[PDB]
């Protein structure tokens, strides 16, 4: 999802990448390094947002997203949920769910 | 190297009390906002609470009237005062310091309520 015209929840929701690059994208396999045995859930992940990003755009807030119709005011409920999830990097999970 | 330091959990019977502390140590930057976050064996992180520079003070329904957040603005640290406790809080906590940068969270603080 790292490339330039790119769609997915991270492509639209985390890090727009602009049809028009010029640059590189070079990534590794921390399994060695990120993963620990319970599960390093320090790294977090959105996956609602009310509209998706503009390119190199940076959202730290951490709002409540209102999935119903009735406003969540800063609480999770109902069709209330937090932005943030956490990933389980573990060094036993498949070559996709590594980090 | 950004450290957060939080201490002041344990094992406490049914009705009880404790104060938690996280002291922040590194770059915090002056707009900082820092919050408390549940972890029980086998759920996610579950927000506890937030406060930010502004003095404001967000809790979720989870505990409500029963948690308290303190500030040192001299120190810039956080106090986590845990009371009227019941089973339903029998969860690790950490700690998360959005600031502007890098977020650095904590090494975790065993809370303990059951009899």
């Known amino acids: 999802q790292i490339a330039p015209g790119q769609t997915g929840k991270i492509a639209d929701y985390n890090y727009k990448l602009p049809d028009d690059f010029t640059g590189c994208v070079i990534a590794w396999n921390s399994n060695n390094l990120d993963s620990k045995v319970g599960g390093n859930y320090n790294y977090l992940y959105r996956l609602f947002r009310k509209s998706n990003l503009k390119p190199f755009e940076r959202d730290i807030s951490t709002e409540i997203y209102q999935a119903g119709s009735t406003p969540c005011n800063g609480v999770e409920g109902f069709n209330c949920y937090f932005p943030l999830q956490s990933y389980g990097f573990q060094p036993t999970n498949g070559v996709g769910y590594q980090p | 190297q950004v450290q957060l330091q939080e201490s002041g959990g344990g094992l406490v019977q049914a009705g009880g009390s404790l104060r938690l502390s996280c002291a922040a140590s590194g770059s915090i930057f002056s707009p900082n906002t820092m919050g408390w976050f549940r972890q029980a064996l086998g759920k996610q992180r579950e927000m506890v609470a937030v406060?930010?520079?502004?003095?404001?003070?967000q809790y979720a329904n989870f505990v409500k009237g029963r948690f308290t957040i303190t500030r040192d603005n001299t120190k810039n640290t956080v106090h986590l005062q845990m009371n009227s406790l019941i089973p339903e809080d029998t969860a690790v906590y950490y700690c998360?310091?959005?600031?502007?940068?890098?977020?650095?969270w904590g090494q975790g603080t065993q809370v303990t309520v059951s009899s």
């Open positions: 998360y310091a959005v600031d502007k940068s890098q977020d650095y």
């Open positions: 406060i930010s520079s502004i003095a404001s003070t």
